[PDB]
């Protein structure tokens, strides 16, 4: 389990990380499900383009927003 | 406690992610923008 | 003897300069002064977390006493303050409760109103008003 | 002068006399002392609060261990409020016109 | 170390006791 | 430790931020040896950057005694009268420059314990709290367990 | 009055530790999180038979880069400038 | 639905009702208008603020002193404008609220004076019967700041 | 307030008496409040080295 | 009407909200003490030291307030007057007095 955790890139606690959705990573996550938390990743808009790289955010509940600002609605 | 803020979308730690961390702290008096920190 | 020790007294003074305010033979006996200074430095280094915890508990106790004197409690006050989109740590709250009672009473009134609005929304399962002082601000 | 008290630089003797003189200069009758709050009257550590009332209206209040020092503190507070040199005054503007 | 079957009931582990207490009827 | 060394309070020397800011550093007496391998950094400093350091702030006077010694030292006096003497024995030019910059930026206060990093002169604004606060007054201030 | 035998945590007659409410709530929330993880880990995408070799090129390139970085170990270069400017220790007012 | 008045029928807390929302909004508008009038007419003095600078919430008032634990990459004698205002108010009125206040509401002006490090602290480790003993001296840089005056604009 | 220094300190740090009536009252709830007011857990200027103890008179 | 806190002690707070939705404004004016909640200050004018034969006899009697005791009863009287413990009225050793900071720093 320690080896799987170290190979999945989860050294520090409370650190987000994105993997694929294939049976291999599925089994690797089922091995350490009692140690980590599995949550899907959804996209409200489109994928970040080349110009929308330095302006991005992960947000809560897994919502990779493409346009993140510091101004209220 | 910070579990109530998990349902609104502002995470649970106010010292990170939001208008209190990404916003520049200090600035000049004439109007020049302060250089962002390395963090 | 060849190139022996000729500056041992300076090391003794450097060690004893940290043991100039102790009781007993610890301020004169080097063999015991070494251990005394070692333990003193170790405790002074390890007591930082203890000092932080003591200050935090003192701030919490002051906030609780102020809330009990005004007419509320501590957990309800903390919840209503964290549910009103206002980020104030315990230090500024204690400083206000000690020096500025008007703003602390205003905060207590706002907390009581927020608690009443939350209770009303829970009993009504809200639908339409959901609290006047509520309405979280969306930052995109 | 930042943070210093007014009468510490003035050092008066009878605050009540100057207070009643200023009140007579402001078309005011005469102030009278009333005991607002108190705690411990027979112990070695007493506390009193004397409030100066002018025409059934409070103007200031001053604490003290006895009644004389409390009335003196109340008169000092009233005289400092009538002169506009209090702790809630406007700070000095250290800028250029 | 004791065996798997004994007469003195033998108190279970802390995690096993927590699991049996949280999964009651 | 704090129980073995004296402490002080955090305050200004003569309120520099209120009115106008003045330079706390006054004189800088440098002692660079003529010959030796222990004052090369000080020699290179006096050769290349002492003119720029003197022209940066006109309120600081630099004295170069040039006394043949073995340990190069520097004397820094401030407005309050404190004299902090440090040695630049075997140091590079950048280290000496950073040291003199830190000496010019600081004042004459002691480098002991800070003791409460925040200091205010008017702490009470809306009235300092007293035990009689948040307590309503009864009719005529009648104490409990009385008849009149 | 009541005495505990040798070590209240190991051995035969031990001091029994019980469960309160905080531990029960923690176990409940952890079981809920684990059930949510089980639900989110119950749907693949490529069904194994559609990934015979999609990202093997990147792995091969990374392995070649690691091999090139590990096989390029050599002592650093040695210049005369250091040996020449080391003579400046006894520098005078020149 | 009718229940007799006993010991456990009615809740111990008094039943609290809520007023009309329209009347409440009207009262709030009247109060904020009175506050704006009192601000524009000049009836305040000696105000304080809670500036969140360097992740430390201070009681920034008129003529005060603060100390941080780092540097600001600025020369001694430059004015610093502080933002992130979450609470402000002189006497008889205070302003709050949602994360921050507006940038045109509160204008805090600070000034750097002294730039000194700190006292030589001691960090020592030790273990029993293991010949383990470590010791260091950490001298972190600090920066002394001083807030001049705090202005307020009546643009509510 | 506009108070000085010694009168302000005497008004801040001062002993305040209290009256706690009994008659059909549990001793635990009364003793809890009595000890809270004796230690100083009802004032914001609470401190162990300040010696801000008050007086509680339980009848 | 509705009030979150009783507006009869300390201060009178009035909660409000800005129509914009980004700030909270509260107006709390100061509250004074009415005239019907105060009592007249007593004036203890005690005078029982003057007579008809002499006039400075009262001035002579004014110098008759002196009483001497040892240590036990004195500490007991101090403890019963100040409501303290008798352990604090005893002297201290010189080792606990030479290390006393006679000139401590002062703030404000
Ligand atoms: Mg045993």
Properties at a glance:
part of a larger assembly; 10 chains; C: 140 residues; mainly alpha; 66% helix; rod-shaped; G: 94 residues; 3 helices; flat; binds magnesium ion; Large ribosomal subunit protein mL63 (chain G)
CATH topology of chain F: Glutaredoxin
Please name the two chains that share the biggest interface, counting residues whose Cβ lies under 8 Å from a Cβ on the partner chain.
Answer: F-H, 27 and 29 residues
The dominant shape of chain B is: elongated
The percent range for helix content of chain F is: 10-25%
Largest sheet features of chain B: none
Bound ions, cofactors and other small molecules, one mention each: magnesium ion
So what's the overall shape of chain F? Answer: elongated
Count of the separate structural domains of chain F: 1
Got a strand count of chain B?
A: 1
| Beta content of chain B | 5-15%
What is the end-to-end distance of chain F?
Answer: 61 Å
| CA distance, first residue to last residue of chain B | 26 Å
The CATH architecture designation of chain F is 3-Layer(aba) Sandwich
| Strand line-up in the sheet with most strands of chain F | 2-1-3-4
Oligomer: part of a larger assembly
Number of contiguous helices of chain B: 0
Helix count from the secondary structure assignment of chain F: 3
The total strand number of chain F stands at: 5
Given helix and strand content, the structural type of chain F is alpha+beta
PDB class: ribosome
Keywords: mitochondrial elongation factor-G1, 55S ribosome, ribosome
Entry title: Structure of the human mitochondrial ribosome-EF-G1 complex (ClassI)
Chain A: 39S ribosomal protein L30, mitochondrial
Structure characterization notes:
This is part of a larger assembly, with 10 protein chains of 10 kinds. With 140 residues, chain C is mainly alpha-helical. Chain C has 5 helices and no strands. Chain C has one domain. Chain C starts with 7 loop residues before the first helix and ends in a 16-residue tail after the last helix. By secondary structure, chain E is mainly alpha-helical. Chain E is 36% helix and 0% strand. Chain E contains 1 helix and no strands. Chain E has one helix at residues 14-22. The termini of chain E are far apart. Chain G has 94 residues and is mainly alpha-helical. Chain G starts with 21 loop residues before the first helix and ends in a 9-residue tail after the last helix. The A-C interface holds A 65, 67-73 and C 137-140. Strand 1 (32-39) of chain D pairs antiparallel with strand 2 (39-40) of chain J. Bound molecules: magnesium ion (MG). Chain B: This is Large ribosomal subunit protein mL52. Chain B: Belongs to the mitochondrion-specific ribosomal protein mL52 family. Chain B: It is found in: Mitochondrion.
